[PDB]
């Protein structure tokens, strides 16, 4: 890769813009996971049946010391709002916290409550060249 954002920058090649078979791209990057729909609200990026049980990740499975963030496929439950306990999720740069609890979240997965690609951009994680290219696309002011 051109820039190494992780270790894998060293190991992987891009291969230009290369086509992969349908719904298998090596890296699952869900840009769409928060993509508003009123009519599809309960069917989009959620369980295919409402009679399914909540995933593994809503439960404490073993003897734990504690966790840092809960997984993002965990589904937001009335207790998430009510209990007033830390609810963290791993997003980038670091972690997203649900601080301001609402019932409107309930019954959806935190995938869906966390905007993956923010309209906010750090100018300090960008090279002067990259900043130029972000000004061309009409994102950054200059």
């Amino acid at each position: 890769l051109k820039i190494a954002k992780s270790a894998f920058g060293f190991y992987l090649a891009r291969r230009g813009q290369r086509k992969y078979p349908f719904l298998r791209r090596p890296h699952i990057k869900n840009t769409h996971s928060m993509n508003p729909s009123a009519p599809y609200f309960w069917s989009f990026m959620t369980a295919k049946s409402q009679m399914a049980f909540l995933p593994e990740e809503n439960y404490i499975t073993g003897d734990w010391t504690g966790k840092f963030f809960v997984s993002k496929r965990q589904v937001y439950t009335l207790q998430h709002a009510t209990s007033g306990a830390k609810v963290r999720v791993k997003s980038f740069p670091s972690i997203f916290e649900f601080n301001s609890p609402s019932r409107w979240n309930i019954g959806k997965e935190m995938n869906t409550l966390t905007k993956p690609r923010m309209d906010l951009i750090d100018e300090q994680m960008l090279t002067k060249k990259q900043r130029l290219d972000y000004v061309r696309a009409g994102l950054l002011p200059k």
Binding site: F10, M34, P36, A38, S94, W104, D119, L120
Partner: protein, 141 residues
């Protein structure tokens, strides 16, 4: 294949900015959601333009004859209950059976986005005058 340049460090106080921005993006999304649900239901509940294309048959026929007779006397109540939404309208016509095989085959219906216009729509421009602040997938007025 050049050795990948190292990525610059993250930013100072950008963790706070990202937290806040996502936080209130979500808070905003609650009202965007509330509002688009209101819109979706308001649309389902309100009347629409007639779904059939009158330029073809059996629909072109004068409103005092043929299919329109069949509608005024047998189907009217039902057609109004479903508010001329194009899906239940087409189904009711299948179930009235007095047209029978024609509904899909000889008859023509307006395209999706035109059939979705509110009843009373006069100019075509209306398709583009609906609210873009709301996430209904064109199911909003």
């Amino acid at each position: 294949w050049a050795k990948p340049k190292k990525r610059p460090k993250v930013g100072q106080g950008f963790h706070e900015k990202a937290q806040k921005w996502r936080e209130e993006y979500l808070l905003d999304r609650h009202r965007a959601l509330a509002d688009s649900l209101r819109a979706y239901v308001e649309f389902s509940t309100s009347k629409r333009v007639e779904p059939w294309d009158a330029r073809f048959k059996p629909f072109d026929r004068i409103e005092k004859d043929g299919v329109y007779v069949l509608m005024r006397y047998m189907m009217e109540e039902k057609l109004q209950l479903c508010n001329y939404h194009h899906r239940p309208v087409k189904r009711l016509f299948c179930n009235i059976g007095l047209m029978g095989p024609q509904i899909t085959t000889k008859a023509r219906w307006k395209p999706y986005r035109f059939a979705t216009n509110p009843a009373g729509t006069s100019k075509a421009e209306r398709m583009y005058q609906r609210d873009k602040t709301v996430y209904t997938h064109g199911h909003n007025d």
